[PDB]
Design an enzyme around this catalytic site. Structure first.
Site, short mmCIF file in Angstrom:
data_model
loop_
_atom_site.label_atom_id
_atom_site.label_comp_id
_atom_site.label_asym_id
_atom_site.label_seq_id
_atom_site.Cartn_x
_atom_site.Cartn_y
_atom_site.Cartn_z
N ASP A 233 3.63 13.56 7.98
CA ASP A 233 2.72 12.40 8.44
C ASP A 233 3.60 11.92 9.41
OD1 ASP A 233 0.15 10.50 8.48
OD2 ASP A 233 1.42 9.40 7.15
N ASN B 10 4.23 5.25 11.68
CA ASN B 10 5.11 5.55 10.34
C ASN B 10 6.56 5.09 10.71
OD1 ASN B 10 2.53 7.16 10.39
ND2 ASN B 10 3.14 7.93 8.40
N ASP C 135 5.64 5.32 4.43
CA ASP C 135 4.27 5.90 3.87
C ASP C 135 4.58 7.53 3.73
OD1 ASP C 135 1.20 6.41 3.69
OD2 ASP C 135 1.41 4.47 4.71
N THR D 95 -3.20 13.73 11.24
CA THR D 95 -3.87 13.14 12.64
C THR D 95 -3.75 14.46 13.73
OG1 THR D 95 -2.88 11.10 11.93
CG2 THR D 95 -3.33 11.80 14.42
N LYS E 297 4.25 10.21 12.85
CA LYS E 297 3.83 9.55 14.05
C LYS E 297 4.55 8.17 14.48
CE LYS E 297 -0.17 8.05 11.26
NZ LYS E 297 -1.75 8.11 11.33
N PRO E 298 4.33 7.62 15.36
CA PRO E 298 4.84 6.42 15.64
C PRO E 298 4.46 5.39 14.72
CG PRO E 298 3.83 7.25 17.70
CD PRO E 298 3.33 7.91 16.50
O1 BA1 Z 1 3.82 0.77 6.27
C1 BA1 Z 1 3.89 -0.39 6.68
N1 BA1 Z 1 2.65 -0.53 7.11
C2 BA1 Z 1 1.57 0.61 7.18
C3 BA1 Z 1 2.12 1.16 8.48
N2 BA1 Z 1 2.08 2.70 8.80
C4 BA1 Z 1 0.92 3.13 9.36
C5 BA1 Z 1 -0.29 2.53 9.31
C6 BA1 Z 1 0.02 0.75 9.14
C7 BA1 Z 1 0.28 0.16 7.69
O2 BA1 Z 1 -0.71 0.75 6.79
C8 BA1 Z 1 -0.97 0.28 5.42
O3 BA1 Z 1 -0.72 -0.82 5.16
C9 BA1 Z 1 -1.39 1.36 4.23
C10 BA1 Z 1 -2.39 0.68 3.84
C11 BA1 Z 1 -2.90 1.48 2.77
O4 BA1 Z 1 -4.50 1.12 2.17
C12 BA1 Z 1 -2.33 2.81 2.64
C13 BA1 Z 1 -3.04 3.80 1.52
O5 BA1 Z 1 -3.94 2.89 0.95
C14 BA1 Z 1 -2.96 4.93 1.44
C15 BA1 Z 1 -1.89 5.37 0.32
O6 BA1 Z 1 -1.45 4.03 -0.08
C16 BA1 Z 1 -1.76 6.48 0.09
C17 BA1 Z 1 -2.59 7.55 0.66
C18 BA1 Z 1 -3.41 7.35 1.72
C19 BA1 Z 1 -3.68 6.00 1.89
C20 BA1 Z 1 -4.93 5.71 2.82
O7 BA1 Z 1 -5.01 4.55 3.29
O8 BA1 Z 1 -5.58 6.44 3.37
C21 BA1 Z 1 -1.30 3.11 2.88
O9 BA1 Z 1 -0.72 4.30 2.79
C22 BA1 Z 1 -0.63 2.48 4.01
C23 BA1 Z 1 4.85 -1.13 6.29
C24 BA1 Z 1 5.92 -0.58 5.46
C25 BA1 Z 1 6.84 -1.45 4.94
C26 BA1 Z 1 7.23 -2.65 5.48
O10 BA1 Z 1 8.52 -3.40 5.33
C27 BA1 Z 1 6.44 -3.27 6.46
C28 BA1 Z 1 5.07 -2.44 6.84
#
Ligand code: BA1
Length: 339
Positions: free
Chosen positions: A155, A160, A173, A190, A157-158
Protein backbone atom coordinates in the site's frame (compact mmCIF):
# COMPACT_ATOMS: atom_id res chain seq x y z
CA UNK A 1 27.42 -6.75 6.18
CA UNK A 2 28.42 -8.67 9.24
CA UNK A 3 26.74 -5.58 10.41
CA UNK A 4 23.43 -5.84 8.45
CA UNK A 5 22.57 -9.43 9.51
CA UNK A 6 22.73 -9.59 13.27
CA UNK A 7 20.68 -6.45 13.38
CA UNK A 8 17.82 -8.03 11.50
CA UNK A 9 18.50 -11.46 13.12
CA UNK A 10 17.50 -9.91 16.38
CA UNK A 11 15.08 -7.68 14.57
CA UNK A 12 13.24 -10.83 13.65
CA UNK A 13 13.26 -12.12 17.20
CA UNK A 14 11.51 -9.18 18.62
CA UNK A 15 9.00 -9.31 15.97
CA UNK A 16 7.89 -12.97 16.40
CA UNK A 17 7.86 -12.84 20.08
CA UNK A 18 5.48 -9.81 19.84
CA UNK A 19 3.53 -11.62 17.24
CA UNK A 20 2.99 -14.79 19.13
CA UNK A 21 1.80 -13.25 22.18
CA UNK A 22 0.53 -9.73 21.59
CA UNK A 23 -1.13 -7.32 24.19
CA UNK A 24 -4.87 -7.34 24.43
CA UNK A 25 -6.00 -3.95 25.71
CA UNK A 26 -4.13 -1.22 27.28
CA UNK A 27 -6.36 1.87 27.64
CA UNK A 28 -9.90 3.28 27.63
CA UNK A 29 -11.66 5.71 25.47
CA UNK A 30 -12.29 8.06 28.25
CA UNK A 31 -8.86 9.12 29.11
CA UNK A 32 -8.75 11.13 26.08
CA UNK A 33 -10.30 14.48 25.01
CA UNK A 34 -11.13 14.25 21.32
CA UNK A 35 -9.77 17.23 19.37
CA UNK A 36 -10.34 17.15 15.60
CA UNK A 37 -10.43 14.71 12.68
CA UNK A 38 -7.22 13.86 10.70
CA UNK A 39 -8.49 11.41 8.12
CA UNK A 40 -11.26 9.18 7.08
CA UNK A 41 -11.78 5.74 5.79
CA UNK A 42 -14.30 3.31 4.87
CA UNK A 43 -14.90 2.33 8.46
CA UNK A 44 -13.36 4.83 10.74
CA UNK A 45 -11.32 7.97 11.10
CA UNK A 46 -8.15 9.19 12.75
CA UNK A 47 -8.32 11.79 15.35
CA UNK A 48 -6.16 14.11 17.18
CA UNK A 49 -6.55 13.26 20.80
CA UNK A 50 -5.06 14.68 23.92
CA UNK A 51 -4.11 12.44 26.90
CA UNK A 52 -6.29 13.51 29.88
CA UNK A 53 -3.58 13.66 32.41
CA UNK A 54 -0.41 13.45 30.33
CA UNK A 55 -0.96 16.25 27.74
CA UNK A 56 0.50 14.07 25.03
CA UNK A 57 -1.46 14.30 21.83
CA UNK A 58 -1.96 11.16 19.74
CA UNK A 59 -3.75 10.16 16.72
CA UNK A 60 -6.52 7.77 17.34
CA UNK A 61 -7.71 5.20 14.93
CA UNK A 62 -11.38 4.37 15.64
CA UNK A 63 -13.15 1.59 13.67
CA UNK A 64 -16.84 0.70 13.56
CA UNK A 65 -16.94 -2.96 14.47
CA UNK A 66 -20.20 -3.21 12.55
CA UNK A 67 -19.30 -1.47 9.33
CA UNK A 68 -16.27 -3.83 9.37
CA UNK A 69 -17.62 -7.27 9.88
CA UNK A 70 -20.40 -6.03 7.71
CA UNK A 71 -17.85 -6.74 5.01
CA UNK A 72 -15.25 -9.26 5.91
CA UNK A 73 -12.37 -7.00 6.65
CA UNK A 74 -12.22 -8.58 9.87
CA UNK A 75 -8.99 -10.30 9.00
CA UNK A 76 -7.42 -7.13 7.80
CA UNK A 77 -8.47 -5.26 10.82
CA UNK A 78 -6.80 -7.61 13.23
CA UNK A 79 -3.62 -7.92 11.18
CA UNK A 80 -3.27 -4.14 11.21
CA UNK A 81 -2.98 -4.14 15.00
CA UNK A 82 -1.20 -7.39 15.13
CA UNK A 83 1.67 -6.20 12.98
CA UNK A 84 1.49 -2.66 14.20
CA UNK A 85 2.44 -3.53 17.70
CA UNK A 86 4.78 -6.16 16.63
CA UNK A 87 7.27 -4.20 14.54
CA UNK A 88 9.73 -1.60 15.62
CA UNK A 89 11.45 0.84 13.22
CA UNK A 90 12.29 4.53 13.08
CA UNK A 91 10.15 4.92 10.09
CA UNK A 92 7.28 2.99 11.30
CA UNK A 93 4.49 4.66 13.35
CA UNK A 94 4.49 3.85 16.99
CA UNK A 95 1.31 2.14 18.26
CA UNK A 96 0.77 3.58 21.74
CA UNK A 97 -2.37 1.87 22.93
CA UNK A 98 -5.09 -0.42 21.71
CA UNK A 99 -8.46 -1.18 23.06
CA UNK A 100 -12.04 -1.90 22.05
CA UNK A 101 -15.57 -1.34 23.12
CA UNK A 102 -19.14 -2.41 22.61
CA UNK A 103 -18.92 -0.77 19.31
CA UNK A 104 -15.45 0.20 18.08
CA UNK A 105 -11.88 -0.95 17.76
CA UNK A 106 -9.35 1.66 18.86
CA UNK A 107 -5.70 2.41 17.96
CA UNK A 108 -3.98 5.30 19.37
CA UNK A 109 -0.77 6.12 17.81
CA UNK A 110 1.72 8.74 17.72
CA UNK A 111 0.84 12.09 16.24
CA UNK A 112 3.18 13.30 13.45
CA UNK A 113 2.32 17.00 13.02
CA UNK A 114 4.00 17.19 9.56
CA UNK A 115 1.01 15.66 8.00
CA UNK A 116 0.97 13.72 4.75
CA UNK A 117 3.33 14.08 1.87
CA UNK A 118 0.63 14.11 -0.68
CA UNK A 119 0.19 17.62 0.45
CA UNK A 120 3.69 18.75 0.54
CA UNK A 121 4.30 17.02 -2.65
CA UNK A 122 1.33 18.75 -4.28
CA UNK A 123 1.98 21.99 -2.61
CA UNK A 124 5.64 22.44 -3.63
CA UNK A 125 5.02 20.88 -7.06
CA UNK A 126 7.90 18.42 -7.27
CA UNK A 127 10.85 17.27 -5.26
CA UNK A 128 14.53 18.02 -5.97
CA UNK A 129 16.40 14.76 -6.74
CA UNK A 130 18.03 15.09 -3.43
CA UNK A 131 14.73 15.68 -1.54
CA UNK A 132 13.38 12.64 -3.32
CA UNK A 133 16.56 10.69 -2.73
CA UNK A 134 16.25 11.36 1.05
CA UNK A 135 12.75 10.02 1.19
CA UNK A 136 13.42 7.01 -0.96
CA UNK A 137 16.43 6.46 1.10
CA UNK A 138 14.12 5.83 3.97
CA UNK A 139 11.47 3.79 2.30
CA UNK A 140 14.10 1.36 1.14
CA UNK A 141 15.55 0.63 4.51
CA UNK A 142 11.97 0.03 5.79
CA UNK A 143 11.09 -2.44 3.13
CA UNK A 144 14.39 -4.15 3.66
CA UNK A 145 13.17 -4.43 7.19
CA UNK A 146 9.62 -5.29 6.28
CA UNK A 147 10.55 -8.00 3.81
CA UNK A 148 12.92 -9.48 6.42
CA UNK A 149 9.88 -10.55 8.34
CA UNK A 150 7.89 -11.98 5.47
CA UNK A 151 5.88 -8.92 5.18
CA UNK A 152 4.67 -7.49 2.02
CA UNK A 153 3.31 -3.93 2.50
CA UNK A 154 1.29 -3.51 -0.65
CA UNK A 155 0.00 0.00 0.00
CA UNK A 156 2.74 2.35 -1.02
CA UNK A 157 1.59 5.91 -1.86
CA UNK A 158 2.23 9.39 -0.80
CA UNK A 159 -0.83 9.62 1.30
CA UNK A 160 0.52 6.89 3.56
CA UNK A 161 3.79 8.83 4.55
CA UNK A 162 3.74 11.31 7.30
CA UNK A 163 6.28 13.90 7.57
CA UNK A 164 7.62 13.68 11.02
CA UNK A 165 8.69 16.80 12.83
CA UNK A 166 12.18 16.36 11.66
CA UNK A 167 11.76 16.00 7.95
CA UNK A 168 11.71 12.22 8.21
CA UNK A 169 8.87 10.28 6.82
CA UNK A 170 6.78 7.80 8.82
CA UNK A 171 4.74 5.02 7.25
CA UNK A 172 1.29 4.52 8.30
CA UNK A 173 -1.52 2.15 7.53
CA UNK A 174 -0.74 -1.48 7.65
CA UNK A 175 -4.35 -2.22 6.72
CA UNK A 176 -3.66 -3.65 3.28
CA UNK A 177 -0.45 -5.26 4.45
CA UNK A 178 -0.05 -9.04 4.78
CA UNK A 179 2.46 -11.48 6.18
CA UNK A 180 3.22 -14.33 3.86
CA UNK A 181 5.77 -16.59 2.30
CA UNK A 182 5.78 -17.08 -1.42
CA UNK A 183 3.16 -15.49 -3.65
CA UNK A 184 -0.25 -14.05 -2.65
CA UNK A 185 -3.14 -13.47 -4.90
CA UNK A 186 -5.44 -10.65 -3.58
CA UNK A 187 -6.00 -7.54 -5.59
CA UNK A 188 -5.18 -5.04 -2.88
CA UNK A 189 -4.40 -1.57 -4.06
CA UNK A 190 -4.63 1.74 -5.98
CA UNK A 191 -4.34 1.63 -9.81
CA UNK A 192 -1.61 4.14 -10.31
CA UNK A 193 0.74 2.14 -8.10
CA UNK A 194 0.07 -1.54 -8.99
CA UNK A 195 2.78 -3.86 -10.23
CA UNK A 196 1.54 -5.58 -13.26
CA UNK A 197 1.86 -8.99 -11.66
CA UNK A 198 -1.23 -8.02 -9.78
CA UNK A 199 -3.28 -6.66 -12.52
CA UNK A 200 -2.74 -9.71 -14.75
CA UNK A 201 -3.60 -11.66 -11.60
CA UNK A 202 -0.86 -14.19 -11.21
CA UNK A 203 0.51 -14.41 -7.75
CA UNK A 204 2.60 -11.58 -6.72
CA UNK A 205 5.21 -11.20 -4.00
CA UNK A 206 7.37 -8.70 -2.08
CA UNK A 207 8.49 -7.54 -5.49
CA UNK A 208 5.42 -5.40 -6.01
CA UNK A 209 6.69 -3.09 -3.19
CA UNK A 210 9.89 -2.18 -5.20
CA UNK A 211 7.94 -1.35 -8.32
CA UNK A 212 5.69 0.90 -6.19
CA UNK A 213 8.97 2.49 -5.06
CA UNK A 214 9.70 3.29 -8.58
CA UNK A 215 6.43 4.99 -9.23
CA UNK A 216 6.88 6.71 -5.99
CA UNK A 217 10.33 8.02 -6.62
CA UNK A 218 9.20 8.81 -10.08
CA UNK A 219 6.27 10.70 -8.81
CA UNK A 220 8.04 12.37 -6.07
CA UNK A 221 10.32 13.58 -8.75
CA UNK A 222 8.12 14.48 -11.75
CA UNK A 223 5.18 15.87 -9.84
CA UNK A 224 2.99 13.17 -11.23
CA UNK A 225 2.85 9.42 -11.44
CA UNK A 226 4.33 7.27 -14.20
CA UNK A 227 1.14 5.64 -15.38
CA UNK A 228 -1.83 7.87 -15.28
CA UNK A 229 -5.09 7.96 -16.84
CA UNK A 230 -8.69 8.92 -16.44
CA UNK A 231 -10.14 5.51 -16.14
CA UNK A 232 -8.44 2.71 -14.15
CA UNK A 233 -9.01 0.58 -17.00
CA UNK A 234 -6.65 2.73 -19.31
CA UNK A 235 -3.99 2.80 -16.58
CA UNK A 236 -3.87 -1.00 -16.55
CA UNK A 237 -3.13 -0.91 -20.26
CA UNK A 238 0.01 1.02 -19.66
CA UNK A 239 1.21 -0.15 -16.37
CA UNK A 240 1.21 -3.50 -17.95
CA UNK A 241 2.65 -2.20 -21.14
CA UNK A 242 5.66 -0.49 -19.50
CA UNK A 243 5.42 2.67 -21.51
CA UNK A 244 7.54 4.80 -19.14
CA UNK A 245 8.30 8.22 -20.63
CA UNK A 246 10.74 10.29 -18.54
CA UNK A 247 10.93 14.03 -18.27
CA UNK A 248 14.08 15.61 -19.56
CA UNK A 249 14.98 16.92 -16.21
CA UNK A 250 15.71 13.48 -14.92
CA UNK A 251 19.30 12.75 -14.18
CA UNK A 252 20.41 9.73 -16.09
CA UNK A 253 21.28 7.82 -13.01
CA UNK A 254 17.75 8.40 -11.91
CA UNK A 255 16.27 7.49 -15.30
CA UNK A 256 18.33 4.29 -14.98
CA UNK A 257 17.09 3.18 -11.60
CA UNK A 258 13.44 3.38 -12.70
CA UNK A 259 14.29 1.48 -15.77
CA UNK A 260 14.79 -1.23 -13.36
CA UNK A 261 12.22 -0.62 -10.63
CA UNK A 262 9.66 -0.23 -13.21
CA UNK A 263 10.73 -3.54 -14.55
CA UNK A 264 7.71 -5.34 -15.90
CA UNK A 265 9.55 -8.66 -15.60
CA UNK A 266 10.10 -9.68 -11.98
CA UNK A 267 12.96 -11.89 -12.77
CA UNK A 268 14.55 -8.67 -14.09
CA UNK A 269 13.13 -6.31 -11.64
CA UNK A 270 15.39 -4.93 -8.86
CA UNK A 271 14.92 -5.68 -5.19
CA UNK A 272 14.04 -9.09 -6.58
CA UNK A 273 17.21 -10.22 -8.50
CA UNK A 274 19.90 -12.22 -6.96
CA UNK A 275 21.79 -9.49 -4.97
CA UNK A 276 18.44 -8.21 -3.74
CA UNK A 277 18.34 -4.93 -1.88
CA UNK A 278 21.98 -4.45 -2.62
CA UNK A 279 21.25 -3.68 -6.22
CA UNK A 280 19.31 -0.60 -5.31
CA UNK A 281 21.17 0.40 -2.26
CA UNK A 282 24.22 0.32 -4.46
CA UNK A 283 23.06 1.71 -7.74
CA UNK A 284 24.80 4.99 -8.35
CA UNK A 285 21.92 7.31 -7.67
CA UNK A 286 22.39 6.35 -3.99
CA UNK A 287 26.06 7.11 -3.88
CA UNK A 288 25.75 10.12 -1.70
CA UNK A 289 23.61 8.36 0.84
CA UNK A 290 25.06 7.25 4.13
CA UNK A 291 22.42 4.50 4.97
CA UNK A 292 23.54 4.32 8.55
CA UNK A 293 23.35 8.02 9.19
CA UNK A 294 19.91 8.02 7.86
CA UNK A 295 18.62 5.04 9.78
CA UNK A 296 19.70 6.97 12.78
CA UNK A 297 18.48 10.28 11.58
CA UNK A 298 21.69 12.15 11.51
CA UNK A 299 21.05 13.76 8.25
CA UNK A 300 19.67 17.16 7.85
CA UNK A 301 16.35 16.84 6.16
CA UNK A 302 15.63 18.67 3.00
CA UNK A 303 12.49 20.00 4.38
CA UNK A 304 11.03 20.61 7.83
CA UNK A 305 7.34 21.36 7.97
CA UNK A 306 6.21 24.28 9.99
CA UNK A 307 4.62 23.52 13.30
CA UNK A 308 3.02 26.16 15.53
CA UNK A 309 2.99 24.15 18.70
CA UNK A 310 1.59 21.29 20.73
CA UNK A 311 -1.43 20.05 18.92
CA UNK A 312 -0.82 21.97 15.76
CA UNK A 313 -3.04 20.57 12.95
CA UNK A 314 -2.50 22.95 10.08
CA UNK A 315 -0.79 20.36 7.85
CA UNK A 316 -4.00 18.26 7.77
CA UNK A 317 -7.05 18.85 5.67
CA UNK A 318 -10.47 19.73 7.26
CA UNK A 319 -13.08 17.04 7.84
CA UNK A 320 -16.72 17.11 8.93
CA UNK A 321 -16.63 15.69 12.41
CA UNK A 322 -19.25 13.54 14.11
CA UNK A 323 -19.29 12.40 17.69
CA UNK A 324 -18.01 8.94 18.67
CA UNK A 325 -21.01 6.68 19.57
CA UNK A 326 -20.47 3.88 22.15
CA UNK A 327 -23.59 1.74 22.31
CA UNK A 328 -24.86 0.45 25.51
CA UNK A 329 -24.69 -3.18 24.62
CA UNK A 330 -21.57 -4.89 23.22
CA UNK A 331 -21.48 -5.44 19.49
CA UNK A 332 -20.11 -8.36 17.75
CA UNK A 333 -17.86 -8.98 20.76
CA UNK A 334 -17.17 -12.54 19.62
CA UNK A 335 -15.74 -11.77 16.18
CA UNK A 336 -13.00 -9.63 17.83
CA UNK A 337 -11.87 -11.78 20.69
CA UNK A 338 -8.30 -11.42 19.54
CA UNK A 339 -8.09 -7.66 18.93
O1 BA1 B 1 -2.92 7.44 8.72
C1 BA1 B 1 -3.32 8.50 9.11
N1 BA1 B 1 -4.35 9.06 8.44
C2 BA1 B 1 -4.77 8.27 7.31
C3 BA1 B 1 -3.70 8.58 6.27
N2 BA1 B 1 -3.36 7.64 5.21
C4 BA1 B 1 -4.11 7.48 4.04
C5 BA1 B 1 -5.47 8.19 4.00
C6 BA1 B 1 -5.84 9.08 5.18
C7 BA1 B 1 -6.07 8.67 6.62
O2 BA1 B 1 -7.02 7.59 6.60
C8 BA1 B 1 -7.57 7.13 7.84
O3 BA1 B 1 -7.67 7.90 8.80
C9 BA1 B 1 -8.06 5.78 7.87
C10 BA1 B 1 -9.42 5.65 8.11
C11 BA1 B 1 -9.97 4.38 8.13
O4 BA1 B 1 -11.33 4.21 8.35
C12 BA1 B 1 -9.18 3.28 7.90
C13 BA1 B 1 -9.84 2.00 7.86
O5 BA1 B 1 -10.96 1.98 8.29
C14 BA1 B 1 -9.34 0.76 7.27
C15 BA1 B 1 -8.56 0.00 8.10
O6 BA1 B 1 -8.43 0.51 9.35
C16 BA1 B 1 -8.00 -1.21 7.70
C17 BA1 B 1 -8.22 -1.56 6.36
C18 BA1 B 1 -8.98 -0.75 5.47
C19 BA1 B 1 -9.55 0.44 5.93
C20 BA1 B 1 -10.37 1.28 5.07
O7 BA1 B 1 -10.78 2.42 5.38
O8 BA1 B 1 -10.69 0.84 3.88
C21 BA1 B 1 -7.83 3.42 7.62
O9 BA1 B 1 -7.08 2.31 7.39
C22 BA1 B 1 -7.25 4.67 7.60
C23 BA1 B 1 -2.51 9.10 10.28
C24 BA1 B 1 -1.78 8.18 11.03
C25 BA1 B 1 -1.02 8.59 12.14
C26 BA1 B 1 -0.96 9.92 12.55
O10 BA1 B 1 -0.17 10.30 13.69
C27 BA1 B 1 -1.66 10.87 11.79
C28 BA1 B 1 -2.45 10.45 10.65
Amino acid sequence: QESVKEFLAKAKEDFLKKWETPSQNTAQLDQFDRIKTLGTGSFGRVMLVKHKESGNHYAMKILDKQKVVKLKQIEHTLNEKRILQAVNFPFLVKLEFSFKDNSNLYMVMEYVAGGEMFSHLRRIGRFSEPHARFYAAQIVLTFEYLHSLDLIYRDLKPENLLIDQQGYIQVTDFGFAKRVKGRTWTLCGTPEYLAPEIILSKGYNKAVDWWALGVLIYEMAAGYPPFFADQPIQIYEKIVSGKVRFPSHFSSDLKDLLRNLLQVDLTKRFGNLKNGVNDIKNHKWFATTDWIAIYQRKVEAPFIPKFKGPGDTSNFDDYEEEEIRVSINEKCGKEFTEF
